[PDB]
Amino acid sequence: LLSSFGTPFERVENALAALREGRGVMVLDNEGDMIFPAETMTVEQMALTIRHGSGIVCLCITEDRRKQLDLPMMVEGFTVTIEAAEGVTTGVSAADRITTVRAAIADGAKPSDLNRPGHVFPLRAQAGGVLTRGGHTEATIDLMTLAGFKPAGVLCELTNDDGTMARAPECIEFANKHNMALVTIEDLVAYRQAHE
Amino acid sequence: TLLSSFGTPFERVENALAALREGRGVMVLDNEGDMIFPAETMTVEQMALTIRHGSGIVCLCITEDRRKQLDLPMMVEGFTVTIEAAEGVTTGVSAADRITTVRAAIADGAKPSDLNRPGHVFPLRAQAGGVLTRGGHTEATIDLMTLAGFKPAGVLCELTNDDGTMARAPECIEFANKHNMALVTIEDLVAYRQAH
Ligand SMILES: [Au+]
Ligand SMILES: [Au+]
Numbered sequence: 380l381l382s383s384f385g386t387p388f389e390r391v392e393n394a395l396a397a398l399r400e401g402r403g404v405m406v407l408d409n410e411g412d413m414i415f416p417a418e419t420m421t422v423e424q425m426a427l428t429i430r431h432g433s434g435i436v437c438l439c440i441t442e443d444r445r446k447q448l449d450l451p452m453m454v455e456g457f458t459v460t461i462e463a464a465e466g467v468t469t470g471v472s473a474a475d476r477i478t479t480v481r482a483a484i485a486d487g488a489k490p491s492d493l494n495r496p497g498h499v500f501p502l503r504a505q506a507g508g509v510l511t512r513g514g515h516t517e518a519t520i521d522l523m524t525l526a527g528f529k530p531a532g533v534l535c536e537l538t539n540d541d542g543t544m545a546r547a548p549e550c551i552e553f554a555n556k557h558n559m560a561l562v563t564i565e566d567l568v569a570y571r572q573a574h575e
Numbered sequence: 576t577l578l579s580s581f582g583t584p585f586e587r588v589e590n591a592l593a594a595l596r597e598g599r600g601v602m603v604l605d606n607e608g609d610m611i612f613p614a615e616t617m618t619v620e621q622m623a624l625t626i627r628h629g630s631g632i633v634c635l636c637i638t639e640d641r642r643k644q645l646d647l648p649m650m651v652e653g654f655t656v657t658i659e660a661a662e663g664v665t666t667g668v669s670a671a672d673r674i675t676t677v678r679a680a681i682a683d684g685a686k687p688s689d690l691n692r693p694g695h696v697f698p699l700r701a702q703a704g705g706v707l708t709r710g711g712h713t714e715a716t717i718d719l720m721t722l723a724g725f726k727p728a729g730v731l732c733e734l735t736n737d738d739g740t741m742a743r744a745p746e747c748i749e750f751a752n753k754h755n756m757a758l759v760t761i762e763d764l765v766a767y768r769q770a771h
Contacts, residue, residue, distance in 0.1 A: 410666060426739025433668050434631010434735075435695055454656055457693045469607055471630050473739025496654045498632055542623025542670025 380563075383551050387566040388573070395526040397560035404522065405561040410536055411550035412515045413559065416523055417484045417531035425473035425533075431553065432535030437500045438480050439519040439532045445503045448483060449490035456504065456516050462497025470498040484531045502534075509568045518564045521571065577748050584763040585770070588722075594757035595723040601757045603719075603764075607733055608747030609712045610756070613720050614681045614728040622670040622730075628750065629732030634697045635677055636716040638727045642700045645680060646687035653701065653713055659694025667695040681728045701727075707768055710761045718764060 384390045394404045403424060404414045413432055415424050417439075428436050438461075440448075450458040463482040467475040479499040482492050505512040508521040519532035537545040537553055545553065554561040581587050591601045598616040603609050610629055612621050625633050634654075637645075647655040660679040664672040676696040679689045702709040705718040716729040734742035734750055742750065751758045 410668075422739060426737065429631055429735055429739060430627070430737050432631065433695070434626055434629065434633075435668065436631075453650065453693045457657070459651055460654070469733070469741065471607075471632070471733050471735070472741050473735075496650050498630075536666075536668050538626060538668070538670075540623065540627050542619065542626055544666065544669050 380547070380551070383555070384561045387563075387569050390560070390562040390566050391525075391570040394522060394560040394562040398522060398526040398528070403557065403559040405537070405550050405554040405559050406515055406518050406522070406534070407547060407550055407561065407563045408513070408515060409544070409546075410515070411545050411547065412534045412536050414515075414519050414522065414532050414534045416526070416528045417480050417533050418529055420477060420480065420533050422473050422477055425477050427557070428533070428535040429473060431537060433538050434535070435500060436476060436533060436535045437502045437516075438483060439502045439504055439516045439534060440483070441520065441530050442503055442506060444484070444531065445501070448488060448493060450493075450495070450501060452503070456502045456514075458501040458503055460496040461493045461499050461501060462495070464492050464494050480533060484529060504530075508571070509564055510571055513564045513568060515564070518567050521567055522562075577745055578758070578760075580748070581758045584760075585767055587757070587759040587763050588767040591719055591757040591759040592723045595719060595725070599755055599757065601719065601759060602734070602747050602751040603712055603715050603731075603759060603761065604744060604747055605710070605712060605761045606741065606744045606747070607712070608742050608744070609716075609731045609733050611712075611716050611719065611729050611731045613723070613725045614677050614730055615725050617674065617677065617730050619671050619674050622674045624754070625730070625732040626670060628734060630735050631732070632697060633673060633730060633732045634699045634713075635680060636699050636701055636713045636729050636731060637680070638717065639700055639703060641681075641728065642698065645685060645690060647692075647698060649700065653699045653711075655698045655700055657693040658690040658696050658698060659692070661689055661691045677730060681726065705768070706761060706765050710765055712761070715761050715764055718768065
């Protein structure tokens with residue numbers, strides 16, 4: 380961990396740089412999630428998440444963004460699911476999922492820009508980020524805001540081919556193979572605490 | 576032809592019923608090809624398969640009666656709100672967890688309390704009348720399960736290439752041949768039903 384990616388603070392900083400550079404980040408909590416900036420995620424990165432991830436690809440958003448899109452919570456942090464109103468076909472391909480993410484996060488996006496339900500799963504982050512709730516959703520948003528992006532990111536859980544969820548060592552190995560950075564939620568909490 | 580390889584249309588349906596009764600999957604084409612399995616026989620390894628080469632949005636096709644029995648609202652005013660087995664799982668995302676959730680939902684005597692919401696399994700409520708009412712993969716699934724002698728509950732997932740594109744028709748055939756699945760089209764099924 381320390382050997383592969385550096386001290387906690389270095390892991391954080393390294394993760395911001397990777398994000399800004401267009402690389403992904405593995406975020407570990409048991410469960411490691413591949414994460415990317417919603418604004419820059421590519422089609423290829425989407426394809427990788429479907430292939431190596433659970434395929435339940437989530438769009439982490441803020442409450443403001445949720446309100447702006449008029450997306451209710453699924454049950455009285457998943458909201459109701461979405462699909463781009465324009466520019467997609469079945470909504471399932473990597474390209475279509477990207478199209479939907481881009482539509483949701485666009486500046487000036489309106490509710491009508493999205494149909495519901497759909498194949499992209501928004502997650503509303505708790506205000507306060509990881510200082511409030513140590514979830515991958517929060518970590519995603521914190522990482523994006525610290526990196527300098529809009530506070531919206533895409534995440535997916537890393538899954539082994541046999542269907543078991545990747546363990547730390549597998550997550551390290553995958554990050555290495557894919558030139559992603561890797562950081563833990565505790566690291567992030569620590570970092571924010573320090574720079575308070 | 577590639578499709579004739581599987582027989583004539585009615586042969587294709589019958590072969591599909593045979594494959595299902597044997598616990599094998601069926602590739603249902605409409606291009607979008609979905610892998611399907613009876614919910615009663617689907618295994619962990621089949622589930623791992625669906626996550627690895629499918630979209631990872633693995634759906635449980637159910638009837639309105641079953642949706643009512645589980646007290647599952649539609650997600651929006653055919654997806655219902657998502658589900659998780661209330662017992663027997665952890666994060667809900669692994670292949671074993673998803674299969675656990677499927678089995679919980681379909682059990683004889685299943686109760687709403689047997690599932691938590693939201694979750695990582697996506698029930699889809701089939702239109703009454705099946706493919707004669709709506710030629711969707713959801714209806715196709717339910718029709719095939721019923722015709723095969725199972726409970727009207729099956730699991731489906733769209734076949735995706737590693738590069739994120741949805742499998743094309745010939746790609747679906749290749750995958751079916753590789754995994755010993757039967758192959759049929761929604762049209763074949765419609766025709767079969769109309770005949771009978
Ligand atoms: Au991990
Ligand atoms: Au298989």
